[PDB]
Structures are given as C-alpha cells and as structure tokens.
Amino acid sequence: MLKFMLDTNICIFTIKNKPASVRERFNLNQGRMCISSVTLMEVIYGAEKSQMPERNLAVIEGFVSRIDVLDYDAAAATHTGQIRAELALQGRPVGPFDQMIAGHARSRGLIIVTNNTREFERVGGLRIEDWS
Amino acid sequence: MLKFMLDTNICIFTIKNKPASVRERFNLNQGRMCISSVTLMEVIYGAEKSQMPERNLAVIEGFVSRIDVLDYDAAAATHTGQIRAELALQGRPVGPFDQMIAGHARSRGLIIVTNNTREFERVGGLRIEDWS
Amino acid sequence: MLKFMLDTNICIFTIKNKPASVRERFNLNQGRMCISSVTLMEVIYGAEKSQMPERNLAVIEGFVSRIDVLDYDAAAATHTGQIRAELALQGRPVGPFDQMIAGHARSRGLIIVTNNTREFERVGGLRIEDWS
Amino acid sequence: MLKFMLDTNICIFTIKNKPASVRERFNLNQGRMCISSVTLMEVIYGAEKSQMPERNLAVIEGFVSRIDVLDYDAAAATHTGQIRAELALQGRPVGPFDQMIAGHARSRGLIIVTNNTREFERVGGLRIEDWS
Amino acid sequence: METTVFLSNRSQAVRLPKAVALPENVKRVEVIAVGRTRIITPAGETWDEWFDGNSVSADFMDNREQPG
Amino acid sequence: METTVFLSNRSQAVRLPKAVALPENVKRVEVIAVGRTRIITPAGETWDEWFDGNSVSADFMDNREQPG
Amino acid sequence: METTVFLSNRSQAVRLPKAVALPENVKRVEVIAVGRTRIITPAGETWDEWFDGNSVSADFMDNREQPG
Amino acid sequence: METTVFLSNRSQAVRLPKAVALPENVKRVEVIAVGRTRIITPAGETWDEWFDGNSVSADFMDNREQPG
C-alpha cells in the first residue's frame, strides 16, 4: 500500500507551516505514505532543540501516528552505499541524511516526496514528486 | 545477548589491518557484538569507492556475516535526536553518522566499541570501549 | 514514547507530599513517564505496611493508573547484573532495588528521575534527573 | 506446562557443582521449569563478577536456553508487596530477591524448587520442593 | 488502522482494531467532539485531579527500608 | 461526555453517546493512536484535526541543519 | 561434517549426513538455540550435553551475596 | 522447542521449528557429534578464518570521509 516516502524537508515544511495544499494531498494519499527513521531523528532534533520540546514533540507525535516509520534496514544501507559511491564518481554533492533517505526509498521502491527536487534529482533510479 | 555495538571506525580499522589484539577481543566476545546499519552502508560505500570493489565487498560481506546488523529503528532515531540537540546546546561536535550510531547503542543500552573514544565521550549516557 | 523511569524514591516523595513542582513536571512530560515493576511492589509494600492499607492502596492505584508499569525483563536483569558487578569492583554501594531500577532504565535507555542523585550517579551509562 | 520455578540458590548450586541428581530431575521435568528475571540478574552478576565472564556467561546461556525466563510482572510485584508486608507483621526475615522470587511464583502459581527450603518456608501460600 | 462504525444500544459506536486498541485497564472514557473528529481520552488521567484528590495517611512509610 | 468500553467480535469497541454522534454521511472513519488518546476522524479528513490545532512553537528550526 | 539447509512444511530443516546419524531408537529429539548454535538432543537427554561439558571457572561465586 | 525427525534424500534429517529457526542467511552448516547430541554450527563463523583469509586492497578508504 505504501507508495510515497516523505523526506525531512517536506515534513518540516508541513509541521512548521501547515500548508493547506499538503493537507489535501495527505488526506487523499493517507495509507500510502511513510517516513524513514532518518527523517524521524531529524524532526526529533528540531523539537528537542527548541525551548518548548514537549509541545513540539506532541505535534510531531500526531504527525507520526498517522503514517508509518520504516526502519533503515540493510537493504537501505546497501542501496545508499552504492548511491554514495555513484555520486562520488560523478562529483555530485548530496547531504548525508538525504543520501540515506534516497537509498531507503530505492530499497523499498518508494516515491520521494519533496519540496526541493534538485537535491534528490542528482541520484539515479529515483522517482520524485513535489508536493509543495 | 548482544553487548557491544562496533563503530565504523573500529570496523574499517580491523578490515584493513586485521590486528591481532582485536581478533582476541572478537574471539572472546563472539556473539555479543553487532554493528548498526549506519555502519554497514559506510563500509559498503568504502568498498564500492575502492579500486577493486567486488574484492573489498567480499571481505566486507565476510565480516558482516559474522556479526549482527541491527536496523536503525525509531528508538535509535529518537535517541539520536536527543543526542543531536544535547551536543548542540553544549557546542560539542560529533559527526553525523557517529551521532546515529551512538543513538542506536544508547536506545539499546549497548557499549560502543570504537578507537576514537574522545568523539564518542562527548555523548552522554553511553558506555565506550577501545578494542584497538 | 517513554523517556523517564521514575524511581521509588521520587514516587513515595510525590505520593506523600504531592509537591507542586513535580505536578508541573508531570503535567509537562505526561505520557513520557514510567515506573518499574520493582517500584510498584515497593509502594504496594508501603501501602500494605500502613495503618490504612486500602486507603493508601487506592492512592497508589490512582498513581500507577496514570503512568506505565514496565515489566522487569531479561534485558533489565542482564544490565542489573553488569551494574551489580561493576559497582562491586569499584566498591561503590547501591541498594538492591535501586540497582534493578537502574538496570531496567539502562536496558531501555531511559532517564532515571529520582531525588537521590548521588546513589544513582555511581551507576555508569545512566542519565539521571531530579524532579523534586 | 510450566509447573516449577527454579530459584537462584538451586540454580547457582547446579551451575557451579553440576550435581548428577539435578541432571535427572532436569531431564525429566524439562518443559515444566522456569526462572524469574530476578534469578537471571543474580546469575549474570556471578558471571560478570568473575575473572572469566565470557566463559561463565556461555555456561549460563546453555542453562537459560533450555528453560523459560519469566518477566517480573505487576502481578509478581503485587504478590511480593503483600508478602513483604505479611513477613513484617510476623517479623520473619527473608532476603529481598528471594521475597520477589516467592511473589513471582505465587502470581503464576508455580512450585518453588530450592536447596534451602527454610528460607521460603516462612512465606505462606507457597509449595516448595528440594531438588538438592 | 481503519475500522467500521456500527449501531448498538441505540447509539453510534465504533470498534477499536487490534493496533489502536486501548489499554484494557481503561474501562471509562471521555469523548470530546472537535468538528467532525472525536477525541477519545481515558476518563481520569489529569494529574491535577490526583494531585488535588485524596492523599495518603501519615503512616505511609517515607523511607523505603531498602534492605541495606 | 463520558462513555463505556465494551467488547465485540473479540476486540475493543466504544459506544458514542448521541450527544457526540457523528454525521450520518460519515460511514468510514479513521482511528489514530496518539499515546492513550484515540483520534477518530472521518476517512479522508484524517489530517484535518492535526492541521487545525496542534500549533508548533516559533523556535521550531525551519531549516534542517544537515551537515553539508 | 558439513551439510545443507532446506525448507520443508514452510520452515527450516537440516539434513544430517549418515556420518552423523542419530541412534535409531532416538525418535524424539529436542533442539536448543544457544546463539547461532542449535543443540539437538534426544528427548529426555536435554541437559546431558550441558552437564557433561560447559565447565564453569573456579572464581564463580558459590554463595549469592544477597543483601541481608 | 521440540520438533520431529524425518527421513529425506536417503538421510536422517530434522526440522527447525519457528522458534529455533536459523538465520535465513545460514545455508551451509557443520554438524559436530558429541555423544548422542548433535551440534549444528553455521559453516564459516571462526573469526580466525577471516582474520587469516583474503584481505582488502590498498584502495580501501581508511578515513570515513564523514561529512563534517
């Protein structure tokens, strides 16, 4: 049932700004959306780095309770490992966490949902959608 | 059960130099040792980045076949999130992948085995050991 | 998820004196707090030892109904075993029940909430907080 | 299927001395035997307190793999809490861990297997067997 | 998880699938209606209530008598 | 309003009083388990509750601080 | 001797070579999972392997050090 | 867990019940016979072998190039 993998950027964008456009897409694609543990730690970091952690955590908890958090498996690691190497030979710069999110999607064959496509665009074998 | 989570640092060190001291530590604590999926992707990256990928990949495969690869779960992500925030507040710098490995260990209560003790000592609530 | 494991000490303190400071900490971190089954038996013992058992028992029941009681698992036992040995080698004295509560927390990576920080500080790999 | 709960004393007695009498009883009552997590941490402590931990742990692991380790639940805690109070009113001295093992048995309705009956004999509602 | 809504005891009622099933201890529940959404919260969880409710007696052993 | 928890079809279910009865058009709903709180929402309006309330504080880092 | 792992009845099973064939009288056996090692023992002789070998070191505290 | 012994490929063989089932990666296994007990250990686990087997090449990146 899972088709889309929500990245960190599109997530934080949604939690902070709560855009209406994203609400409809979320309500429509409910059940086919998931995030990576990599994405999770990042949103946890944001909440824990704030002066009102508990408040922000709860907001996050509501978000997470409606989707599935997939665990970074050996498959994700393998794919990302390859990916990292490929980008190196090509000299394309992608951030670490983002590299892992991309690998996680490839391992499970999911669609990356982002607001910054240009970032994931360098990696090959990836279908990306901009829900911004 | 498992007691030790081997860091990427300690892994690459052993794979390249195959030190005698570490063999004894391995032979002594066999079965109580694991790595994180974060570590796996990193050594996979190294092998695929090498001039004889399949060669080093085979070595890498042998190594992982003998330990347990734990999946970066939501528990690990949460702890890493905390760790990330904590380190920031204190201005203590720890690398991204290392931050995640530390969280994975703390979330499970494992002893980090690494050769770079200073980097991981900055993290709190974590037991560290140098098997080099 | 759960973040804090309340010690027996902090529990009895709150049940008897119902301090305002702790209420705020409770209301703030509601849902992220738990006690160990070791703690449960101890406060049950206290109530059954009291001159109005059913009265204090009812109070005790209300308290536990609002937090989560985690079961002392094999993971907790193993960590406590380690802790017990470690403390012995160093000649650091920690009480029996406290040793077990510490293990339960460490095995899960929880922050010990207690008012006796010095006793629990002797234990290594454990994060402690005083909510008194 | 579980009928007997092996206490710490009868366990250590068996692991250290490996008595023939206990072997037959074990081989005969295989499947109807269990230990408490309380017992576990105690045998872990013994192994970890020794100069050859890994060796002793393995011996223990063989032992544990053939029985079931029951987790100290709220039921065990409740029963032990009552028990502790009862002994107090009666002025009967029983060791802490032993108090918990007794409660754990009562909660699940198991037979305490011991070499020192006199210890558990003070607690009421307990059926005890000496397998020494 | 998504369940189905049914009618019982002359009232609209809903099933709690295995995943979202409540703690079995929770027998009484308060329902808050926010728009088209229903908030089901265990009746009796406010710490402020217990912190202001009945207290223990003076006999309540302050120290734990931890053997040692 | 408060209500009771009963068992049907070997799982938990909750009666909703007529005071908190959902629109008749709403046949399919979606239950979300946030801690001990269950959020029943009409299917297709699952995120409405989260988007409406649940405001995040201003300090919430709008960037990402990804090393790079 | 080495052997192969196959699947039968939707679970794992292991062929044992005739070089390591168990006594014909032994029909019921007991498998124990110690780490990655599986210990197959004739039913009723489960503890024989553990009691025979698996010697514990002398420093192993024969008392209990229970606070009291 | 206790299983049952069967005969296949003209050899005595045993099933690994769900509980004691081996890691699926383990396809080759060495069987050691100690009396009436059989020790099933994954073929290829001795660290001494890998520590004495093939090594990596000089290209193997010592530092991790951890972004930062």
Author numbering:
A (entry chain A), B (entry chain C), C (entry chain C), D (entry chain A): 1 to 132
E (entry chain D), H (entry chain D): 1 to 68
F (entry chain B), G (entry chain B): 1G, 2 to 68
Task: Give the published text.
VapBC TA systems are the most common Type II TA system in bacteria, and consist of a VapB antitoxin and VapC PIN domain-containing toxin. The VapB antitoxin consists of two domains, an N-terminal promoter-binding domain and a C-terminal, intrinsically disordered region, which conceals and inhibits the active site of the VapC toxin in the VapBC complex. Like many Type II TA systems, vapBC expression is auto-regulated at the transcriptional level through direct binding of the higher-order TA complex to two operator sites (OS1 and OS2) in its promoter. The related vapBC locus on the chromosomally integrated Escherichia coli F plasmid is mutated in bacteria that are tolerant to beta-lactam antibiotics, before subsequently evolving resistance.
To investigate the structural consequences of the vapB tolerance mutations, we used X-ray crystallography to determine structures of several VapB variants in complex with VapC. In VapBC hetero-octamers, two distinct SpoVT/AbrB-type DNA-binding domains are formed through dimerization of the N-terminal domains of two molecules of VapB, in a “crossed fingers” configuration. Mutations that confer E. coli tolerance to antibiotics map to the N terminus of VapB (VapBT3N, VapBT3N+L7P, VapBV5E, VapBL7P, VapBA13P, VapBL16R, VapBV20G, and VapBT3N+A13P+L16R) in vapBC on the chromosomally integrated F plasmid. However, we noticed that the DNA-binding domain of VapB appears to be quite flexible and with low local resolution, which means that side chains are not visible in the regions containing the mutations. In conclusion, the potential tolerance mutations of VapB do not appear to affect the ability of VapBC to form the canonical hetero-octameric structure.
